Design a protein around this ligand. Structure first.
Ligand SMILES: OC[C@H]1O[C@@H](O)[C@H](O)[C@@H](O)[C@@H]1O
Ligand SMILES: OC[C@H]1O[C@@H](O)[C@H](O)[C@@H](O)[C@@H]1O
Ligand SMILES: OC[C@H]1O[C@H](O)[C@H](O)[C@@H](O)[C@@H]1O
Ligand SMILES: NS(=O)(=O)c1ccc(F)cc1
Ligand SMILES: NS(=O)(=O)c1ccc(F)cc1
Ligand SMILES: [Zn+2]
Length: 257
C-alpha cells in the first residue's frame, strides 16, 4: 500500500488514486502576496469547549487523536463555511529535520510540522457521506515552528511511547485541543483535498497564519514513532508530508486586510 518512502510515496500515489493529478489537490504553496483579503468571509468560530477526546491511534502514517462526534460538541463554523462542521480527529505531519515537515508552505517556506484538525459537515450525517460531497470537510491547519515548548502539546508527546508502532492505540480522554491553537485566528482559505490517499476533493482548507512554537524535544519525540508494526523492521515515522501541488484554477483568500 501507500506510504512516504521512495517506493510508495507521493510520486507513486497517482497509480492507485488517479485524483492525485486532479484539479484541486492539497497541499499548496500559499503565496502571501497574491492571496487577497475577502470581505465576504464571516467571523471564524472555533468552538471546542465541550470537546470529548477518546483515543490516540498510530495508523502507520501518523497518529490520530480521535473525538466523540456523535453530537454537536467541538465544532468549527463561520469564515468560508456554510453550516456546522464537527471535529472528528486531529493529527500532524512532520519532518526528519526541523527545516521540513509541513504540507502547506508559505512563500515556499517549509515549517517543521503541521497540525490538521479535521471536521465534517453535519448536513451530510456521517464522515463517510461527507467525503462524497464537494463541501464535506473542513480542515484547520496550524504550522509548528521550533522554539519554546507548547504546554498543551506535552500530554500528546508523553503518550507516544505507548503507541510506537502501527496498530497501537491508547486511551486519550480529557484532552483539550484548545491548547494547540496560536493566539490569532487570522487565516488563509482555499478549496482542496485530503493530503493522503484517497486524496478526495472534499475539503475547505483554513490555514492559520500564526504558527505555534513547540520545543525541539517535543518534535524529536514525534520522530521516535514507527511506520511499521510491532516486530517488523523499524522505519522511523518521519517525513510523512506530501509536497505542494499545482494551484490550478484556484485563489487563496485571506481573512485579514
Ligand atoms: O478535558 C478536556 C476538555 O473537555 C471538555 O469536555 C471540557 O468542557 C473542557 O473544559 C476540558 O478542558
Ligand atoms: O472579476 C473580479 C473578481 O475576480 C475574482 O477572480 C476575484 O476573486 C474577485 O475578488 C474579484 O472581484
Ligand atoms: O488528556 C489526555 C491524557 O493526558 C494524560 O496522558 C493523562 O494521564 C490521561 O489521563 C489523559 O487521557
Ligand atoms: N500507488 S501506491 O498506493 O502508492 C503503491 C505504490 C507501490 C506499490 F507497490 C503499491 C501501491
Ligand atoms: N491530511 S488531511 O488532509 O487532513 C486528512 C484528513 C482526513 C483524512 F481521512 C485523510 C487526510
Ligand atoms: Zn493531515
Amino acid at each position: 500500500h501507500w506510504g512516504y518512502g521512495k517506493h510508495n510515496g507521493p510520486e507513486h500515489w497517482h497509480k492507485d488514486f488517479p485524483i492525485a493529478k486532479g484539479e484541486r489537490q492539497s497541499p499548496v504553496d500559499i503565496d502571501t502576496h497574491t492571496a487577497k483579503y475577502d470581505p465576504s468571509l464571516k467571523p471564524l468560530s472555533v468552538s471546542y469547549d465541550q470537546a470529548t477526546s477518546l483515543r490516540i491511534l498510530n495508523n502507520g502514517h501518523a497518529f490520530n487523536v480521535e473525538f466523540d462526534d456523535s453530537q454537536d460538541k467541538a465544532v468549527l463554523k463561520g469564515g468560508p463555511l456554510d453550516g456546522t462542521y464537527r471535529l472528528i480527529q486531529f493529527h500532524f505531519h512532520w519532518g526528519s529535520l526541523d527545516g521540513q515537515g509541513s504540507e502547506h508552505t508559505v512563500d515556499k517556506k517549509k515549517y517543521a510540522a503541521e497540525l490538521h484538525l479535521v471536521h465534517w459537515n453535519t448536513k451530510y450525517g456521517d464522515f463517510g457521506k461527507a467525503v462524497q460531497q464537494p463541501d464535506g470537510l473542513a480542515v484547520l491547519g496550524i504550522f509548528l515552528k521550533v522554539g519554546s515548548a507548547k504546554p498543551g502539546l506535552q500530554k500528546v508527546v508523553d503518550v507516544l511511547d505507548s503507541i510506537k508502532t502501527k496498530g497501537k492505540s491508547a486511551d486519550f480522554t480529557n484532552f483539550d485541543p484548545r491548547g494547540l491553537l496560536p493566539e490569532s485566528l487570522d487565516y488563509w482559505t482555499y478549496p482542496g483535498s485530503l493530503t493522503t490517499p484517497p486524496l478526495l476533493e472534499c475539503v475547505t482548507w483554513i490555514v492559520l497564519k500564526e504558527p505555534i512554537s513547540v520545543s525541539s524535544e517535543q518534535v524529536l519525540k514525534f520522530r521516535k514513532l514507527n511506520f511499521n508494526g510491532e516486530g517488523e523492521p523499524e522505519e522511523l515515522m518521519v517525513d510523512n508530508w506530501r509536497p505542494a501541488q499545482p494551484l490550478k484554477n484556484r485563489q487563496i483568500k485571506a481573512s485579514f486586510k
